[PDB]
Subunit: 255 residues, 4 copies
């Protein structure tokens, strides 16, 4: 898995704990050139501090709020103009309101339901469409999902239906972009303490149950997600598309 | 036997509607039926289709599931007109036609969100409001297609709306189970309907079923209805969060 | 209503057997029932349990599904005694005690193969022999457990037999589909039975259902039997190669 | 991925077209020590001739018929004495009579049904048990499966039920061996012209459906399976266990 002369766009770093920063460290250690997108200026500030730990000689940073068609379209356009064609995209982006991540799913508001779909699922579709322009010879797109997309997990509520939606998006993108030699896959990460995890009720309980019940008896971390991202984004996974790899200590496989 | 049961059926548009299939079966079983429709078309249409049924009266309510207020006032009214209900059959979905062909990667934000709104979110607010009419418990069934589980050619934005609906069912099963409300899905095989006309290559889809599915025949709306009757009754008391394929066994082969 | 239908129920040992839940329901719905058994002790219990049913006749056949001869000759006798049948409920599994606890990696070859033979192969041969008595189609249902789909502590060799059983249902559905013979499974939640005493930590499993499953209660044998009635009847005519969870929604959560 | 100082056992090479030989070539490229097990004398012969294509400085060949406990037990024990501890096992073994394979599935004989389970599924359990003794600090076990284990595929018949058994075996082994840090996983390969494929009815029409329908619109090869094996057998896939990775051009994702 040597990645020199490969370029990947990593979307969704907010701070040192981000799953996307685990990917960035692994890709960067494997010699890839990296392009980062962020939403909040605070995330750019963190990226600028975090880039100090990476071997990248150039900070390539773009503000892309995936709610904006304009900003995805012009951001990727700009990316191509600055770094030329790319090899793949790591999508690590999701959002829901706090109100909708605890108590009763049946009480989800329409606006909070469509908000989570728009940011956490649709964003992959329009990103794939725009990123495909920069991959005339093929490439690899990987999104980050959670087991809550496949089963009802307590408290995960609106996010789970948005992850179900994301995991299908991956399948439909895989079929549609296959003839272009663009692979599309998801990683299903086990619970990891991030800024977003703070919004999920019951999160400490979830971690504990993994240590008690998952086959490896331990939690996974961000670098483990990254190592599997390196596989998915690289030629090691030629042949693999429409797939969902659980990086979760085995927990998906047990009841 | 469904005498003294009452079910709300959402999404009859014409004689070919899957929901009319459900209707004829529940009616044949002695249930009292309430209907909800979106446009006045499906109303005059329902007025005439209701003459086939043995319903001694016409409980019709206009509900566009795109409006919270309509879903709310609608179910409140049903509650005043008929009292507590035993279940809801959801048979409602939509996507713009240009989204149901060519390249899924070219889907608009607006069309993606519209399909989610009508085809998946609708079940959540329907269930919240229907719950109010089921203090003793009850049964909610939605209609999905195999396209929510696998990428199918042309089905596109609706495949992601279905994947969403299927998890919606799971999360509603978990939330509503302590209230004794079961929530399930029927994954219907391909049936020629009004909406079925809007999917690219629907005929190639019907023919594949005959050639390849275990029963080597297509299903009809009555078979969906027979399985709705099971899920909506005490025959399925132990069963919730489930997805039952009424598709001649297509789901189980490759 | 199942009057003028005939079903063979395989695997009643006592009043707690899942298959006796199936028998009660089907008997209540007016079916003629034929029973098969392995141990003497099980025929005795069967004779006693019949007094609670409305069967005018005791139709009882010893069939140890480890023997081809017994299955072939059992089904042939059944056809001579009662004629053509409408389906078969299979409620048979076995593994050695030390293979339902501890470490799966230490399973013996003879134990693994024993569990496959009785718990999965037996369906294939029963289907072949039963097909002969279903010239116009019918319905076959096997009983499975979520441990065939996931690794469950202590279920061990039986988990692998159930995974084999669940595929056997799909391959049989595809094979026998063109003969209008449907094949399905019910994945039952945990229920206190004689066999359940072989599974390490059973009580803990039961408590986990009550605490975590959507319905927050365990299921019983009659709930299994109600879903069997649906699968074994024309209500489910469109449905084959399917696995219906009767487990209070436990399969749908994590 | 770099695999110097790692040792793997590869079971089930018969000739140049065997899936397991694609595994061998990839791992050998990555610097692994490889140890090879075979059943038929003809397979040891092909092995000896195929070894010349490889960088292995040393033939390590062991006859093991997985029908025999003794041969599995003694085989792994001798491997231990010859090479030391190992880092994992690639399992590429299956078998079923022609005479059951070209029946209506409902006509499968008891002895052929159990033969296929014995060789194609049970053998993994016993291999894992014996190989565990050579993995005190952990390691990784990979087995080869096919989509016909998850769905009823025309003609695949008794082997579909065996693959279903194998895929559960993987899960139960993952759970049992997890606390010892041994990961167990499966690769679900797409159709590949092998000696074994020559017993599946209508193999050619299966091949061509892939090209017409699979998102990548093309068939896979042995080397693509090997690259995914290298991933599964290496530290890249820490956190992954009880997983089934489809290497099949995305075919598993479509209907
Ligand atoms: N932590 C876990 O246990 C876990 C497990 C499985 C899956 N996941 C998934 O992992 C992914 C990354 O999350 P994380 O856990 O690493 O948390 P995180 O560090 O908070 O990252 C989430 C990212 O989403 C971005 N984002 C939200 N809305 C956006 C928008 N409109 N446009 C652009 N970016 C937007 C955030 O950017 P800003 O902060 O700049 O707004 C942030 O960088 C998510 O898809 C999540 O669902 C997490
Ligand atoms: N036909 C198939 O092969 C098939 C297979 C699997 C699943 N399904 C599912 O079955 C369900 C019914 O489809 P069908 O084939 O029976 O087509 P149909 O007869 O055209 O029914 C579609 C129904 O959805 C209603 N609807 C659309 N948007 C609505 C809205 N905003 N508010 C309220 N109602 C709305 C339509 O109402 P108006 O016309 O009054 O607007 C119509 O009654 C859908 O969920 C569909 O996805 C169909
Ligand atoms: N109870 C549960 O929680 C549970 C949950 C899910 C699925 N299941 C499945 O339900 C089915 C039976 O369940 P149960 O729990 O009801 O146990 P049960 O009352 O102990 O019945 C098991 C039956 O299997 C029969 N059997 C064993 N070996 C046989 C053989 N070689 N030939 C013919 N019959 C044989 C036994 O007959 P004899 O006594 O005459 O030997 C007995 O009637 C099994 O398939 C089991 O795996 C059980
Ligand atoms: N080819 C495909 O399209 C395909 C697709 C998906 C999965 N698979 C799986 O891939 C694996 C490898 O098969 P293949 O296609 O590569 O065919 P293959 O080249 O014929 O290899 C099959 C191997 O199985 C070995 N084997 C059979 N019985 C054995 C026993 N009792 N003890 C030890 N080894 C035994 C054979 O060894 P001997 O020749 O020495 O008897 C042979 O080396 C199998 O598990 C197969 O089911 C194949
Ligand atoms: C709840 C267990 C694992 C987990 C933790 C954090 C996650 O990230 C988000 C959760 C909710 C909204 C936005 C992001 C997430 O998607 C999954
Ligand atoms: C592809 C064939 C099966 C099929 C036919 C009709 C269906 O109903 C709709 C299809 C597209 C938009 C709205 C509803 C539907 O969801 C599935
Ligand atoms: C593990 C809890 C559910 C459960 C309980 C009992 C079961 O029946 C048998 C269990 C082991 C051997 C034979 C039958 C069974 O298959 C499943
Ligand atoms: C059916 C298409 C793919 C395929 C081909 C060859 C396979 O290997 C064997 C198939 C049958 C018996 C032994 C091995 C195999 O397991 C799968
Ligand atoms: N139950 C507390 C703690 C949850 C957590 O661990 O994040 C909450 O709802 O915030
Ligand atoms: N832990 C108990 C469980 C037995 C049971 O409940 O079946 C034991 O091993 O006996
Ligand atoms: N036992 C049912 C089978 C139903 C079916 O084959 O559709 C019958 O009476 O035929
Ligand atoms: N269908 C042909 C070809 C089989 C094959 O390609 O393996 C046959 O029955 O042998």
């Amino acid at each position: 898995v040597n990645l020199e002369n490969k370029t990947y766009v990593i979307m969704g770093i907010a701070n040192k704990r981000s799953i996307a920063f685990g990917v960035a460290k692994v890709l960067d250690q494997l010699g890839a050139k990296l392009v980062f997108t962020y939403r909040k200026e605070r995330s750019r500030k963190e990226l600028e501090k975090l880039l100090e730990q990476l071997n990248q000689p150039e900070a390539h940073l773009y503000q892309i709020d995936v709610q904006s068609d304009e900003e995805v379209i012009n951001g990727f356009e700009q990316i191509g103009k600055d770094v030329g064609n790319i090899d793949g995209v790591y999508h690590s982006i999701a959002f829901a309101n706090m109100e909708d991540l605890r108590g009763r799913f049946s009480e989800t508001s329409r606006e909070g339901f469509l908000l989570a779909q728009d940011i956490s699922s649709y964003s992959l579709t329009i990103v794939a469409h725009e990123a495909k322009k920069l991959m005339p010879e093929g490439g690899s797109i990987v999104a980050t999902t959670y087991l809550g997309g496949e089963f009802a997990v307590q408290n995960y509520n609106v996010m789970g239906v948005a992850k179900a939606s994301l995991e299908a998006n991956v399948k439909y993108l895989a079929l549609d972009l296959g003839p272009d030699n663009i692979r599309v896959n998801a990683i299903s990460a086990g619970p990891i303490r991030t800024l977003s995890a703070k919004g999920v009720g019951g999160f400490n309980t979830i971690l504990k149950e993994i240590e008690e019940r998952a086959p490896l008896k331990r939690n996974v971390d961000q670098v483990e997600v990254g190592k599997t991202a390196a596989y998915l984004l690289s030629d090691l996974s030629s042949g693999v598309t429409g797939e969902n790899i659980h990086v979760d200590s085995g927990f998906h496989a047990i009841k």
